[PDB]
Amino acid sequence: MKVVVIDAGHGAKDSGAVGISRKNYEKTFNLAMALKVESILKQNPKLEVVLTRSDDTFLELKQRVKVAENLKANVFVSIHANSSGSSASNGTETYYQRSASKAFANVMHKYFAPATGLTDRGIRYGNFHVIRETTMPAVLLEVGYLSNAKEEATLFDEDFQNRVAQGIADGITEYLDVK
Ligand SMILES: [Zn+2]
């Protein structure tokens, strides 16, 4: 089968970005999203879904990449939530670091971006360890900004997460052509 590695950014001592409300942590959002994407993709027998973390545990960047490399993942998707010094910043972004990951970023963004319904900030280059050191198509998704009051609430909305999780799942399913 085709192996899909889903990486929920941060975890444990690393809370990631703290929402403007000061009541939500990015790590919480990342895990909830990863678990939802896993549940959706698990229904596909042509896929073998592996999560770098399935609970609130700490994982070094090198460790997340090692799993993907060791299990020979076909794709790698790191899920994150963004933060800005200005509470006005908002939108969804998809990052790639290597040329071989651009096709996947394009397909992923095609289904992922519309699902968030947030401002489409497009596909951008990002020098992030997990998408740089990986050798298979790898993208990092910054779903939305936790620094924006309305957007933070939206990212922690159950329906939003389910819709976006399906979009992320579609990006993977479509790219791997396992419909
Ligand atoms: Zn992050």
PDB file of C-alpha atoms and ligand atoms in Angstrom:
ATOM      1  CA  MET A   1       0.000   0.000   0.000  1.00  0.00           C
ATOM      2  CA  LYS A   2       0.943   3.668  -0.171  1.00  0.00           C
ATOM      3  CA  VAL A   3       2.204   5.091   3.112  1.00  0.00           C
ATOM      4  CA  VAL A   4       0.935   8.455   4.310  1.00  0.00           C
ATOM      5  CA  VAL A   5       2.637  10.182   7.224  1.00  0.00           C
ATOM      6  CA  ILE A   6       0.671  12.890   9.003  1.00  0.00           C
ATOM      7  CA  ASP A   7       2.660  15.088  11.340  1.00  0.00           C
ATOM      8  CA  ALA A   8       0.785  17.124  13.950  1.00  0.00           C
ATOM      9  CA  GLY A   9       3.171  19.968  14.666  1.00  0.00           C
ATOM     10  CA  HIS A  10       4.578  20.513  18.144  1.00  0.00           C
ATOM     11  CA  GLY A  11       3.362  18.690  21.230  1.00  0.00           C
ATOM     12  CA  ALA A  12       3.811  18.307  24.971  1.00  0.00           C
ATOM     13  CA  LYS A  13       6.220  20.980  26.207  1.00  0.00           C
ATOM     14  CA  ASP A  14       6.018  22.582  22.751  1.00  0.00           C
ATOM     15  CA  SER A  15       2.575  24.183  22.631  1.00  0.00           C
ATOM     16  CA  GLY A  16       3.274  25.893  19.338  1.00  0.00           C
ATOM     17  CA  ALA A  17       1.448  29.202  18.938  1.00  0.00           C
ATOM     18  CA  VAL A  18      -0.887  30.337  21.719  1.00  0.00           C
ATOM     19  CA  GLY A  19      -4.214  31.667  20.458  1.00  0.00           C
ATOM     20  CA  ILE A  20      -5.061  35.322  21.018  1.00  0.00           C
ATOM     21  CA  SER A  21      -7.788  34.129  23.413  1.00  0.00           C
ATOM     22  CA  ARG A  22      -4.931  32.636  25.442  1.00  0.00           C
ATOM     23  CA  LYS A  23      -7.102  29.544  25.961  1.00  0.00           C
ATOM     24  CA  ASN A  24      -6.014  27.498  22.935  1.00  0.00           C
ATOM     25  CA  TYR A  25      -2.686  25.941  21.917  1.00  0.00           C
ATOM     26  CA  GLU A  26      -1.636  25.188  18.348  1.00  0.00           C
ATOM     27  CA  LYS A  27      -0.473  21.697  19.366  1.00  0.00           C
ATOM     28  CA  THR A  28      -4.058  20.897  20.347  1.00  0.00           C
ATOM     29  CA  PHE A  29      -5.386  21.991  16.962  1.00  0.00           C
ATOM     30  CA  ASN A  30      -2.670  20.108  15.072  1.00  0.00           C
ATOM     31  CA  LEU A  31      -3.388  16.831  16.842  1.00  0.00           C
ATOM     32  CA  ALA A  32      -7.170  17.109  16.475  1.00  0.00           C
ATOM     33  CA  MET A  33      -6.684  17.701  12.747  1.00  0.00           C
ATOM     34  CA  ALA A  34      -4.188  14.862  12.317  1.00  0.00           C
ATOM     35  CA  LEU A  35      -6.522  12.437  14.085  1.00  0.00           C
ATOM     36  CA  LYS A  36      -9.469  13.493  11.920  1.00  0.00           C
ATOM     37  CA  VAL A  37      -7.470  13.132   8.708  1.00  0.00           C
ATOM     38  CA  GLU A  38      -6.336   9.719   9.926  1.00  0.00           C
ATOM     39  CA  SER A  39      -9.907   8.565  10.566  1.00  0.00           C
ATOM     40  CA  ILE A  40     -10.943   9.602   7.060  1.00  0.00           C
ATOM     41  CA  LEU A  41      -7.968   8.030   5.283  1.00  0.00           C
ATOM     42  CA  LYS A  42      -8.205   4.850   7.373  1.00  0.00           C
ATOM     43  CA  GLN A  43     -11.313   3.942   5.367  1.00  0.00           C
ATOM     44  CA  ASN A  44      -9.123   3.604   2.262  1.00  0.00           C
ATOM     45  CA  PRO A  45      -7.580   0.100   2.028  1.00  0.00           C
ATOM     46  CA  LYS A  46      -5.042   1.333  -0.540  1.00  0.00           C
ATOM     47  CA  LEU A  47      -3.464   3.515   2.139  1.00  0.00           C
ATOM     48  CA  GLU A  48      -1.386   2.922   5.243  1.00  0.00           C
ATOM     49  CA  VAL A  49      -1.711   6.001   7.453  1.00  0.00           C
ATOM     50  CA  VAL A  50       0.966   6.694  10.038  1.00  0.00           C
ATOM     51  CA  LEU A  51       0.920   9.589  12.485  1.00  0.00           C
ATOM     52  CA  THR A  52       4.197  10.854  13.931  1.00  0.00           C
ATOM     53  CA  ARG A  53       2.186  11.551  17.087  1.00  0.00           C
ATOM     54  CA  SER A  54      -1.314  10.508  18.112  1.00  0.00           C
ATOM     55  CA  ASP A  55      -1.290  12.103  21.555  1.00  0.00           C
ATOM     56  CA  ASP A  56       0.259  15.036  23.390  1.00  0.00           C
ATOM     57  CA  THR A  57       3.847  13.814  23.199  1.00  0.00           C
ATOM     58  CA  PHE A  58       7.001  15.742  22.347  1.00  0.00           C
ATOM     59  CA  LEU A  59       8.861  14.961  19.128  1.00  0.00           C
ATOM     60  CA  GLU A  60      12.018  16.538  17.736  1.00  0.00           C
ATOM     61  CA  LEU A  61      11.895  17.664  14.105  1.00  0.00           C
ATOM     62  CA  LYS A  62      14.522  15.059  13.197  1.00  0.00           C
ATOM     63  CA  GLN A  63      12.373  12.349  14.776  1.00  0.00           C
ATOM     64  CA  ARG A  64       9.312  13.267  12.695  1.00  0.00           C
ATOM     65  CA  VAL A  65      11.376  13.120   9.509  1.00  0.00           C
ATOM     66  CA  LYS A  66      13.020   9.835  10.499  1.00  0.00           C
ATOM     67  CA  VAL A  67       9.644   8.103  10.735  1.00  0.00           C
ATOM     68  CA  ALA A  68       8.738   9.226   7.228  1.00  0.00           C
ATOM     69  CA  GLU A  69      12.110   8.144   5.836  1.00  0.00           C
ATOM     70  CA  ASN A  70      12.249   4.823   7.674  1.00  0.00           C
ATOM     71  CA  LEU A  71       8.702   3.806   6.710  1.00  0.00           C
ATOM     72  CA  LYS A  72       9.358   5.006   3.154  1.00  0.00           C
ATOM     73  CA  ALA A  73       6.347   7.315   3.125  1.00  0.00           C
ATOM     74  CA  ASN A  74       4.849   8.182  -0.256  1.00  0.00           C
ATOM     75  CA  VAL A  75       3.835  11.579   1.114  1.00  0.00           C
ATOM     76  CA  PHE A  76       4.353  13.625   4.258  1.00  0.00           C
ATOM     77  CA  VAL A  77       1.950  16.258   5.552  1.00  0.00           C
ATOM     78  CA  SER A  78       2.713  18.427   8.558  1.00  0.00           C
ATOM     79  CA  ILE A  79      -0.288  20.225  10.047  1.00  0.00           C
ATOM     80  CA  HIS A  80       0.128  23.564  11.794  1.00  0.00           C
ATOM     81  CA  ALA A  81      -1.700  26.744  12.799  1.00  0.00           C
ATOM     82  CA  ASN A  82      -0.130  30.159  12.175  1.00  0.00           C
ATOM     83  CA  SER A  83       0.579  33.220  14.307  1.00  0.00           C
ATOM     84  CA  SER A  84       1.436  36.839  13.564  1.00  0.00           C
ATOM     85  CA  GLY A  85       2.459  39.903  15.549  1.00  0.00           C
ATOM     86  CA  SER A  86      -0.699  41.527  14.180  1.00  0.00           C
ATOM     87  CA  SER A  87      -4.132  40.161  15.105  1.00  0.00           C
ATOM     88  CA  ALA A  88      -5.278  41.234  11.642  1.00  0.00           C
ATOM     89  CA  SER A  89      -3.260  38.560   9.823  1.00  0.00           C
ATOM     90  CA  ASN A  90      -5.406  35.736   8.479  1.00  0.00           C
ATOM     91  CA  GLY A  91      -5.578  33.005   5.895  1.00  0.00           C
ATOM     92  CA  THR A  92      -4.535  29.542   4.806  1.00  0.00           C
ATOM     93  CA  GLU A  93      -1.058  28.731   3.469  1.00  0.00           C
ATOM     94  CA  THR A  94       0.562  25.598   2.007  1.00  0.00           C
ATOM     95  CA  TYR A  95       4.352  25.256   2.079  1.00  0.00           C
ATOM     96  CA  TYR A  96       6.831  23.133   0.126  1.00  0.00           C
ATOM     97  CA  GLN A  97      10.647  23.257   0.272  1.00  0.00           C
ATOM     98  CA  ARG A  98      11.764  20.922  -2.506  1.00  0.00           C
ATOM     99  CA  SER A  99      10.934  20.889  -6.201  1.00  0.00           C
ATOM    100  CA  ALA A 100       9.738  17.275  -5.973  1.00  0.00           C
ATOM    101  CA  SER A 101       7.069  18.403  -3.478  1.00  0.00           C
ATOM    102  CA  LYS A 102       5.515  21.137  -5.625  1.00  0.00           C
ATOM    103  CA  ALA A 103       3.117  18.862  -7.527  1.00  0.00           C
ATOM    104  CA  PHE A 104       1.780  17.535  -4.245  1.00  0.00           C
ATOM    105  CA  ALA A 105       1.537  21.051  -2.790  1.00  0.00           C
ATOM    106  CA  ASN A 106      -0.495  22.103  -5.840  1.00  0.00           C
ATOM    107  CA  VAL A 107      -2.909  19.175  -5.560  1.00  0.00           C
ATOM    108  CA  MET A 108      -3.130  19.484  -1.776  1.00  0.00           C
ATOM    109  CA  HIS A 109      -3.858  23.217  -1.925  1.00  0.00           C
ATOM    110  CA  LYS A 110      -6.532  22.601  -4.573  1.00  0.00           C
ATOM    111  CA  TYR A 111      -8.677  20.681  -2.074  1.00  0.00           C
ATOM    112  CA  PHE A 112      -7.312  21.953   1.220  1.00  0.00           C
ATOM    113  CA  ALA A 113      -7.581  25.720   0.674  1.00  0.00           C
ATOM    114  CA  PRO A 114     -11.259  25.880  -0.390  1.00  0.00           C
ATOM    115  CA  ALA A 115     -12.146  23.662   2.571  1.00  0.00           C
ATOM    116  CA  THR A 116     -10.937  26.200   5.144  1.00  0.00           C
ATOM    117  CA  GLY A 117     -12.975  28.918   3.465  1.00  0.00           C
ATOM    118  CA  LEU A 118     -10.392  31.343   4.830  1.00  0.00           C
ATOM    119  CA  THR A 119      -8.343  33.816   2.816  1.00  0.00           C
ATOM    120  CA  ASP A 120      -6.286  31.885   0.281  1.00  0.00           C
ATOM    121  CA  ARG A 121      -2.688  32.887   0.938  1.00  0.00           C
ATOM    122  CA  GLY A 122      -1.511  30.381  -1.666  1.00  0.00           C
ATOM    123  CA  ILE A 123       1.392  27.967  -1.973  1.00  0.00           C
ATOM    124  CA  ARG A 124       4.725  29.273  -0.717  1.00  0.00           C
ATOM    125  CA  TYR A 125       8.316  28.188  -0.280  1.00  0.00           C
ATOM    126  CA  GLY A 126       9.175  27.480   3.331  1.00  0.00           C
ATOM    127  CA  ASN A 127      12.541  26.367   4.659  1.00  0.00           C
ATOM    128  CA  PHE A 128      11.100  24.114   7.356  1.00  0.00           C
ATOM    129  CA  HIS A 129      13.014  21.083   8.622  1.00  0.00           C
ATOM    130  CA  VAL A 130      10.237  18.517   8.214  1.00  0.00           C
ATOM    131  CA  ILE A 131       9.613  19.365   4.548  1.00  0.00           C
ATOM    132  CA  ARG A 132      13.288  19.994   3.751  1.00  0.00           C
ATOM    133  CA  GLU A 133      14.912  16.872   5.201  1.00  0.00           C
ATOM    134  CA  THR A 134      12.200  14.522   3.953  1.00  0.00           C
ATOM    135  CA  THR A 135      12.849  12.820   0.608  1.00  0.00           C
ATOM    136  CA  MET A 136       9.271  12.151  -0.497  1.00  0.00           C
ATOM    137  CA  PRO A 137       6.701  14.797  -1.488  1.00  0.00           C
ATOM    138  CA  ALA A 138       6.224  16.817   1.684  1.00  0.00           C
ATOM    139  CA  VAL A 139       4.167  19.857   2.542  1.00  0.00           C
ATOM    140  CA  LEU A 140       3.448  21.854   5.668  1.00  0.00           C
ATOM    141  CA  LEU A 141       0.002  23.342   6.083  1.00  0.00           C
ATOM    142  CA  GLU A 142      -0.641  26.475   8.126  1.00  0.00           C
ATOM    143  CA  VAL A 143      -4.419  26.140   8.334  1.00  0.00           C
ATOM    144  CA  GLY A 144      -5.192  29.559   9.768  1.00  0.00           C
ATOM    145  CA  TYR A 145      -4.036  32.209  12.246  1.00  0.00           C
ATOM    146  CA  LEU A 146      -4.526  31.653  15.965  1.00  0.00           C
ATOM    147  CA  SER A 147      -3.505  35.282  16.489  1.00  0.00           C
ATOM    148  CA  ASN A 148      -6.779  36.490  14.959  1.00  0.00           C
ATOM    149  CA  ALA A 149      -9.761  36.313  17.323  1.00  0.00           C
ATOM    150  CA  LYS A 150     -12.343  35.208  14.756  1.00  0.00           C
ATOM    151  CA  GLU A 151     -10.005  32.823  12.954  1.00  0.00           C
ATOM    152  CA  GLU A 152      -8.826  31.183  16.183  1.00  0.00           C
ATOM    153  CA  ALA A 153     -12.447  30.462  17.120  1.00  0.00           C
ATOM    154  CA  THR A 154     -13.019  29.056  13.641  1.00  0.00           C
ATOM    155  CA  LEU A 155      -9.980  26.770  13.767  1.00  0.00           C
ATOM    156  CA  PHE A 156     -11.289  25.277  17.002  1.00  0.00           C
ATOM    157  CA  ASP A 157     -14.781  24.824  15.595  1.00  0.00           C
ATOM    158  CA  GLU A 158     -15.633  21.140  15.153  1.00  0.00           C
ATOM    159  CA  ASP A 159     -17.437  21.526  11.837  1.00  0.00           C
ATOM    160  CA  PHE A 160     -14.564  23.587  10.433  1.00  0.00           C
ATOM    161  CA  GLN A 161     -12.060  20.906  11.430  1.00  0.00           C
ATOM    162  CA  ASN A 162     -14.117  18.105   9.908  1.00  0.00           C
ATOM    163  CA  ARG A 163     -14.523  19.989   6.639  1.00  0.00           C
ATOM    164  CA  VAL A 164     -10.826  20.864   6.468  1.00  0.00           C
ATOM    165  CA  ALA A 165      -9.772  17.356   7.484  1.00  0.00           C
ATOM    166  CA  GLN A 166     -11.758  16.040   4.537  1.00  0.00           C
ATOM    167  CA  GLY A 167     -10.087  18.572   2.272  1.00  0.00           C
ATOM    168  CA  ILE A 168      -6.644  17.501   3.459  1.00  0.00           C
ATOM    169  CA  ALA A 169      -7.629  13.859   3.017  1.00  0.00           C
ATOM    170  CA  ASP A 170      -8.787  14.593  -0.542  1.00  0.00           C
ATOM    171  CA  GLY A 171      -5.490  16.297  -1.335  1.00  0.00           C
ATOM    172  CA  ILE A 172      -3.661  13.121  -0.329  1.00  0.00           C
ATOM    173  CA  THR A 173      -6.130  10.756  -1.970  1.00  0.00           C
ATOM    174  CA  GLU A 174      -6.160  12.712  -5.225  1.00  0.00           C
ATOM    175  CA  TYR A 175      -2.380  13.078  -5.380  1.00  0.00           C
ATOM    176  CA  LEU A 176      -1.765   9.403  -4.642  1.00  0.00           C
ATOM    177  CA  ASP A 177      -4.533   8.488  -7.083  1.00  0.00           C
ATOM    178  CA  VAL A 178      -6.168   5.997  -4.720  1.00  0.00           C
ATOM    179  CA  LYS A 179      -9.793   7.085  -5.117  1.00  0.00           C
TER     180      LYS A 179
HETATM  181 ZN    ZN B   1       3.485  25.275  14.083  1.00  0.00          ZN
END
